[PDB]
Design a protein around this ligand. Structure first.
Ligand code: R4S
Length: 287
């Protein structure tokens, strides 16, 4: 409901960009004194078509109703006159994504497992509101402080239809996708759990680019495959091939990743089942 007046918005820097959206940091200072607030503002590119434009209004709606400690805070909206839509105004998460943070700060196993647990809490909450994330990766997990992580983007999030268990593109994050998404084109709550396992893998590799899911999966498929990357990915996953065990990852946590990566979606734990398990594995490594 909150409206941001564009007259007090001074752009500081870019925070991220996708194929149709962009996030920039702004100072919102209705003075010029030291009462100024730091905000993250998401805008839809003015060139985006009607499908992306209607999906944008849906994204804004989803964030307006989502309230959880491990989910980015919605701040307000403002008229984006140049793009002839709205701009999504959110809180500025000071330490950025884990994708950018982890390659530069050696973090202990216990802190990573705590982050893992916080992602699950945020995701179980999202699933209880009947939404699927569709884009759970370390790039969408924002660090507030060394003990607080938040799901910071909902660009692909969809409401699961009332009498259905699932929701039915070159921008799709295929290297974080369960075989049922790639093959049957169906996204279940269990499909987000697969993606979590990929995000947990990223955390345990400290988001090293040479260990990343696209790097690792493209080394297994090869690069001279024509339009067959997705087809070849679907078949290595069906032969039980998986992302390796990250160096310094305990066997137990790796088994847990493998359980999120069950080919049979029904054999995957829910995010509710993951919470007490992660609490327990974290308490262990914290001491
Ligand atoms: O950029 C996008 N989505 C989000 C998840 C990305 C980063 N974003 C946000 N980032 C931050 N803080 C911060 C600090 N540093 N850095 C850059 C290093 O990571 C980002 N706060 C709020 C946000 F909303 C939103 C969509 C493709 C356009």
């Amino acid at each position: 409901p909150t409206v941001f007046h564009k007259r007090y918005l001074k752009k500081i820097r870019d925070l991220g960009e996708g194929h149709f959206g962009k996030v920039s940091l702004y100072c919102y200072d209705p003075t010029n004194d030291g009462t100024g607030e730091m905000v993250a503002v998401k805008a839809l590119k003015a060139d985006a078509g009607p499908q992306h434009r209607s999906g944008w209004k849906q994204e804004i709606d989803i964030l307006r109703t989502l309230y959880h400690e491990h989910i980015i805070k919605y701040k307000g909206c403002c008229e984006d006159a140049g793009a002839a839509s709205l701009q999504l105004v959110m809180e500025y998460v000071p330490l950025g994504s884990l994708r950018d943070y982890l390659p530069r700060h050696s973090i202990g196993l216990a802190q990573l497992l705590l982050f893992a647990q916080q992602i699950c809490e945020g995701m179980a909450y999202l699933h209880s509101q009947h939404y699927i994330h569709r884009d759970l990766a370390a790039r969408n997990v924002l660090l507030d402080n060394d003990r607080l992580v938040k799901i910071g983007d909902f660009g692909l999030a969809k409401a699961v239809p009332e009498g259905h268990e699932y929701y039915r593109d070159g921008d799709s994050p295929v290297f974080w996708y369960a075989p049922e998404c790639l093959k049957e084109y169906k996204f279940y709550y269990a499909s987000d759990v697969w993606s979590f396992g990929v995000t947990l893998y990223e955390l345990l590799t400290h988001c090293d680019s040479s260990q990343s899911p696209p790097t690792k999966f493209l080394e297994l498929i090869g690069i001279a495959q024509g339009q067959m990357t997705v087809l070849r990915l679907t078949e290595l996953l069906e032969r039980g091939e998986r992302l390796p065990r990250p160096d310094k990852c305990p066997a137990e946590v790796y088994h847990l990743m493998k359980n999120c990566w069950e080919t049979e979606a029904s054999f995957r734990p829910t995010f509710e089942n993951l919470i007490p398990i992660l609490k327990t594995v974290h308490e262990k490594y914290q001491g």
